[PDB]
């Protein structure tokens with residue numbers, strides 16, 4: 001119902017959210033139990049921007065002041081522009097810096113979602129901004145006066161939103177920068193999630209390793225993704241989460257909509273993996289915090305499967321883990337949230353014949369009345385004849401992480417409450433499932 005965009009400062013995770021009108025504030029130690037702390041801004045004209053800690057008092061509000069740079073409509077023309085708000089009480093409440101934007105609209109329709117970072121090497125702030133099909137970069141010494149430095153022009157991935165810019169140390173010991181943004185590659189058969197480019201950033205401009213982006217999710221439902229620092233350490237791992245939008249699938253003329261607008265994804269951890277050469281990829285996995293939700297565990301012996309094998313289990317909300325291996329089959333995977341008559345299920349698996357991983361929601365409750373968005377697909381090498389799955393199943397979502405999680409699929413899916421079976425499957429050949437474990441979870445969401 002309420003999208004969260006977390007940030008770590010002063011010993012806790014925080015997020016702020018609009019509530020109709022006013023800006024509210026929630027806090028968390030574990031990214032499980034969020035506690036609302038009240039109103040941070042009594043009157044505010046989804047919210048768009050970033051919150052930073054000005055540790056060295058560059059902005060003049062004091063060492064450790066909390067500063068938000070936010071997109072709002074201009075008083076004159078309603079055009080998107082960037083305004084500064086500051087807190088001198090540790091992020092409890094914020095006041096506006098003057099009445100003028102710190103970065104005004106240059107007469108354009110798309111000018112939003114400032115992502116502000118401190119560039120220690122260049123000794124300055126940098127802002128990445130969504131500007132239609134390009135990401136704009138702006139520099140500042142003091143958060144108040146900004147200067148354009150460059151633009152990063154995207155190609156064939158629609159309108160860009162919610163850019164991200166961060167530095168990570170890969171497992172080979174090389175630092176890379178990553179430029180990310182939400183985007184919409186559906187016209188080219190690519191995802192509508194979070195596109196990213198590993199590369200280099202010099203304080204002024206971003207140079208990608210390759211022109212074509214990688215995607216942090218290949219599911220249908222992982223939009224407006226955000227990454228944030230790990231507070232209990234910063235270069236080795238980050239956290240991320242995104243929005244899974246149900247209302248945006250509405251495709252009727254009347255404008256009424258159900259009560260379910262969407263849901264946050266689970267929080268994932270992301271690491272930067274060297275894949276050989278100058279090739280790097282982000283790898284995703286559910287946060288480890290999630291294991292404190294484990295109610296019980298079912299473990300299975302090695303299972304050979306040809307066609308079908310039905311598990312003797314009831315599972316509704318859970319983490320499934322398994323290793324699978326095979327030889328010459330066409331496809332392999334899991335029928336999750338399976339009805340007793342076997343007609344309803346959620347399918348997660350590998351197409352060896354097609355060279356892709358998939359999640360198919362065409363046999364369960366699903367949000368698209370046109371039945372266009374049924375089976376998400378991500379590249380999978382057809383020569384690789386083993387895979388590890390980690391799958392989080394909940395009442396309205398399935399989130400599948402393949403191997404180390406370079407490819408992940410996040411999808412809305414709406415199984416019936418009593419559809420709780422699991423059947424393993426193959427097509428045109430035998431597979432072996434090993435180390436199959438089901439961790440039954442309490443649902444937070």
Ligand SMILES: [Ca+2]
Pocket residue numbers: 192220223248
């Ligand atoms: Ca979409």
Ligand SMILES: [Ca+2]
Pocket residue numbers: 248
């Ligand atoms: Ca859309």
